[PDB]
Write an enzyme that holds these catalytic residues in place. Structure first.
Site, PDB file in Angstrom:
ATOM      1  N   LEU A 164       0.792  -1.221   0.000  1.00 49.94           N
ATOM      2  CA  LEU A 164       0.000   0.000   0.000  1.00 49.94           C
ATOM      3  C   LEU A 164       0.825   1.272   0.000  1.00 49.94           C
ATOM      4  CD1 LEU A 164      -2.845  -0.911   2.518  1.00 49.94           C
ATOM      5  CD2 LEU A 164      -2.883  -0.875  -0.004  1.00 49.94           C
ATOM      6  N   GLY A 195       7.832   4.576   2.915  1.00 47.47           N
ATOM      7  CA  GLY A 195       8.153   5.749   3.700  1.00 47.47           C
ATOM      8  C   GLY A 195       9.472   5.594   4.430  1.00 47.47           C
ATOM      9  N   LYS A 196       9.818   6.653   5.170  1.00 55.65           N
ATOM     10  CA  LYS A 196      11.083   6.683   5.901  1.00 55.65           C
ATOM     11  C   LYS A 196      11.169   5.539   6.903  1.00 55.65           C
ATOM     12  CE  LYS A 196      14.092  10.242   8.049  1.00 55.65           C
ATOM     13  NZ  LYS A 196      14.103  11.502   8.859  1.00 55.65           N
ATOM     14  N   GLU A 212       7.089   0.197   5.697  1.00 56.68           N
ATOM     15  CA  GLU A 212       6.246  -0.153   4.573  1.00 56.68           C
ATOM     16  C   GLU A 212       4.909  -0.635   5.094  1.00 56.68           C
ATOM     17  OE1 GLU A 212       8.841  -3.154   3.705  1.00 56.68           O
ATOM     18  OE2 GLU A 212       9.387  -2.433   1.671  1.00 56.68           O
ATOM     19  N   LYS A 262       1.969  -2.907   9.104  1.00 51.14           N
ATOM     20  CA  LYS A 262       2.940  -1.824   8.993  1.00 51.14           C
ATOM     21  C   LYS A 262       4.260  -2.389   9.496  1.00 51.14           C
ATOM     22  CE  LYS A 262       4.008   2.714  10.913  1.00 51.14           C
ATOM     23  NZ  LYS A 262       3.478   3.799  11.789  1.00 51.14           N
ATOM     24  N   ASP A 271       3.280  14.905  13.260  1.00 52.31           N
ATOM     25  CA  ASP A 271       3.451  14.603  11.853  1.00 52.31           C
ATOM     26  C   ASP A 271       2.106  14.654  11.144  1.00 52.31           C
ATOM     27  OD1 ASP A 271       4.981  14.107   9.618  1.00 52.31           O
ATOM     28  OD2 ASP A 271       5.158  11.957   9.993  1.00 52.31           O
TER      29      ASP A 271
HETATM   30  C1  LIG Z   1       1.585   5.289   5.797  1.00 47.15           C
HETATM   31  C2  LIG Z   1       1.242   4.394   6.952  1.00 47.15           C
HETATM   32  O1  LIG Z   1       2.054   4.246   7.889  1.00 47.15           O
HETATM   33  C3  LIG Z   1      -0.100   3.726   6.998  1.00 47.15           C
HETATM   34  N1  LIG Z   1      -0.517   3.219   8.212  1.00 47.15           N
HETATM   35  C4  LIG Z   1      -1.781   2.669   8.074  1.00 47.15           C
HETATM   36  C5  LIG Z   1      -2.612   2.088   9.022  1.00 47.15           C
HETATM   37  C6  LIG Z   1      -3.868   1.644   8.638  1.00 47.15           C
HETATM   38  C7  LIG Z   1      -4.236   1.772   7.321  1.00 47.15           C
HETATM   39  F1  LIG Z   1      -5.454   1.283   6.938  1.00 47.15           F
HETATM   40  C8  LIG Z   1      -3.435   2.340   6.355  1.00 47.15           C
HETATM   41  C9  LIG Z   1      -2.178   2.814   6.737  1.00 47.15           C
HETATM   42  C10 LIG Z   1      -1.089   3.505   6.045  1.00 47.15           C
HETATM   43  C11 LIG Z   1      -1.214   3.820   4.661  1.00 47.15           C
HETATM   44  C12 LIG Z   1      -0.606   4.753   3.868  1.00 47.15           C
HETATM   45  N2  LIG Z   1      -1.126   4.558   2.648  1.00 47.15           N
HETATM   46  C13 LIG Z   1      -0.804   5.238   1.394  1.00 47.15           C
HETATM   47  C14 LIG Z   1      -1.268   6.635   1.395  1.00 47.15           C
HETATM   48  C15 LIG Z   1      -1.508   7.172  -0.004  1.00 47.15           C
HETATM   49  C16 LIG Z   1      -1.786   8.662   0.172  1.00 47.15           C
HETATM   50  N3  LIG Z   1      -3.030   8.917   0.910  1.00 47.15           N
HETATM   51  C17 LIG Z   1      -3.106  10.364   1.122  1.00 47.15           C
HETATM   52  C18 LIG Z   1      -4.461  10.967   0.890  1.00 47.15           C
HETATM   53  N4  LIG Z   1      -5.286  10.855   2.087  1.00 47.15           N
HETATM   54  S1  LIG Z   1      -6.856  11.159   1.927  1.00 47.15           S
HETATM   55  O2  LIG Z   1      -7.542  10.339   2.879  1.00 47.15           O
HETATM   56  O3  LIG Z   1      -7.157  11.025   0.535  1.00 47.15           O
HETATM   57  C19 LIG Z   1      -7.118  12.836   2.378  1.00 47.15           C
HETATM   58  C20 LIG Z   1      -6.405  13.381   3.435  1.00 47.15           C
HETATM   59  C21 LIG Z   1      -6.670  14.680   3.832  1.00 47.15           C
HETATM   60  C22 LIG Z   1      -7.634  15.450   3.184  1.00 47.15           C
HETATM   61  C23 LIG Z   1      -7.940  16.833   3.642  1.00 47.15           C
HETATM   62  C24 LIG Z   1      -6.973  17.840   3.627  1.00 47.15           C
HETATM   63  O4  LIG Z   1      -5.728  17.561   3.159  1.00 47.15           O
HETATM   64  C25 LIG Z   1      -7.275  19.117   4.091  1.00 47.15           C
HETATM   65  C26 LIG Z   1      -8.545  19.401   4.568  1.00 47.15           C
HETATM   66  C27 LIG Z   1      -9.519  18.421   4.585  1.00 47.15           C
HETATM   67  C28 LIG Z   1      -9.189  17.169   4.128  1.00 47.15           C
HETATM   68  F2  LIG Z   1     -10.115  16.184   4.194  1.00 47.15           F
HETATM   69  C29 LIG Z   1      -8.322  14.882   2.114  1.00 47.15           C
HETATM   70  C30 LIG Z   1      -8.071  13.585   1.707  1.00 47.15           C
HETATM   71  C31 LIG Z   1      -2.996   8.259   2.238  1.00 47.15           C
HETATM   72  C32 LIG Z   1      -2.560   6.795   2.163  1.00 47.15           C
HETATM   73  N5  LIG Z   1      -2.038   3.572   2.660  1.00 47.15           N
HETATM   74  N6  LIG Z   1      -2.090   3.117   3.891  1.00 47.15           N
HETATM   75 CL   LIG Z   2       0.237   3.930  11.187  1.00 47.59          CL
END
Ligand SMILES: CC(=O)c1[nH]c2ccc(F)cc2c1-c1cn(CC2CCN(CCNS(=O)(=O)c3ccc(-c4c(O)cccc4F)cc3)CC2)nn1
Ligand SMILES: [Cl-]
Length: 331
Positions: free
Chosen positions: A44, A47-48, A51, A67, A155
């Site tokens: 999915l 990152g630093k 994964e 994770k 963060d």
């Molecule tokens: C990385 C990591 O430790 C991790 N750990 C997990 C634990 C459980 C799990 F299930 C998954 C993971 C992941 C995890 C990380 N990822 C990949 C990324 C791909 C990029 N999107 C960003 C866009 N966000 S998003 O909701 O559209 C979005 C965000 C913010 C807004 C927004 C704004 O920026 C400003 C104002 C209002 C808003 F709503 C909009 C959309 C997030 C996921 N998948 N899973």
């Molecule tokens: Cl997380």
């Protein structure tokens, strides 16, 4: 002399009043399961520090996220785990469901509830002003909770917010930079992502607090409603502050520096320059006006302040007129 001390305006002593095992994460003992309960389906993201894989729990067929931690300091692992457990069940906090180690490589992984974020590029470029207000409220519910629990996320940024729009579900994820707030403790300023670093981090003011998360919240709101990703597009940590100076102005920056007796790196001498504080209108245009309103600009101006002590707390934010409509519907 050196810097002037600072204490958070809210939730100041919340951790002083808790039993020691709450925040003394260095001593939390961890119990490991077998990663062989979880089979990885697909990757999915990376990152630093980790994964992230979509996986299936083979004992109950439930879909989960694994994770896999890259090598961090052993105590940062305890820290993240202890924070996740302390916050578990809180509003819009990602739920930690398991802690496993690869049986051979002995790499540690955390197991979370699955959030379905696929087809998100559509989400990005098509959130209504209402939806942005809604999801901002959801983020704030998560930040007031964790701040009230004595925890700084550190963060906040779009990548650490997971949304499943089909079910209007938001989770604040990746707590691996989060720290407990303790009055008088001086933290590491080398945190957060460059475009979201608060002025306190850019000037090396180490005694910061939950207000940092709200500066970061400010940078997401601005880059959402103006459609300028990132809003403060700095080319390194030094120039990041210059880019903030070019919007917020230098007068308020140098008043902040003076207020806290901040020693300013001599590098900033030549680059910070002299800049007037800009009006938010010069970032509006026909492509983003539908997301900009007076309320949104009042709200945002009240988050993006040099002086962390003067930014809106999470709770104060949720009370801003910007969210008047969201609050009404929830009822
Ligand atoms: C990385 C990591 O430790 C991790 N750990 C997990 C634990 C459980 C799990 F299930 C998954 C993971 C992941 C995890 C990380 N990822 C990949 C990324 C791909 C990029 N999107 C960003 C866009 N966000 S998003 O909701 O559209 C979005 C965000 C913010 C807004 C927004 C704004 O920026 C400003 C104002 C209002 C808003 F709503 C909009 C959309 C997030 C996921 N998948 N899973
Ligand atoms: Cl997380």
């Amino acid at each position: 002399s050196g810097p002037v001390p600072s204490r958070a305006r809210v939730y100041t002593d919340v951790n002083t009043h808790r039993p020691r095992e709450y925040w003394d994460y260095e001593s939390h003992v961890v119990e490991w399961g077998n990663q062989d309960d979880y089979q990885l389906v697909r990757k999915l993201g990376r990152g630093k520090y980790s994964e992230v894989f979509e996986a299936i729990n083979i004992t109950n067929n439930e879909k989960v996220v694994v994770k896999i931690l890259k090598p961090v300091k052993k105590k940062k692992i305890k820290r993240e785990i202890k924070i996740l457990e302390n916050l578990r069940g809180g509003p819009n906090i990602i739920t930690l469901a398991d802690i496993v180690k690869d049986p051979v490589s002995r790499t540690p992984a955390l197991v979370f509830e699955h959030v379905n974020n696929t087809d998100f590029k559509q989400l990005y470029q098509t959130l209504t002003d209402y939806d942005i207000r809604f999801y901002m409220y959801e983020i704030l519910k998560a930040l007031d909770y964790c701040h009230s629990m004595g925890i700084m996320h550190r963060d906040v940024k779009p990548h650490n917010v997971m949304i499943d729009h089909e079910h209007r579900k938001l989770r604040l994820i990746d707590w691996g930079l989060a720290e407990f707030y303790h009055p008088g403790q001086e933290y590491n300023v080398r945190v957060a992502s460059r475009y979201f670093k608060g002025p306190e981090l850019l000037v090396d003011y180490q005694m910061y607090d939950y207000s940092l998360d709200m500066w970061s919240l400010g940078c997401m709101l601005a880059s959402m409603i103006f459609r300028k990703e990132p809003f403060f597009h700095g080319h390194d940590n030094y120039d990041q502050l210059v880019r903030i100076a070019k919007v917020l102005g230098t007068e308020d920056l140098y008043d902040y520096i003076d207020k806290y007796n901040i020693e300013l790196d001599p590098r900033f001498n030549d680059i910070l320059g002299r800049h007037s504080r800009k009006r938010w209108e010069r970032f509006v245009h026909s492509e983003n006006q539908h997301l900009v309103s007076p309320e949104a600009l009042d709200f945002l101006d009240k988050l993006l302040r040099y002086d962390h002590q003067s930014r809106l707390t999470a709770r104060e934010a949720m009370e801003h007129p910007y969210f008047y409509t969201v609050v009404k519907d929830q009822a």
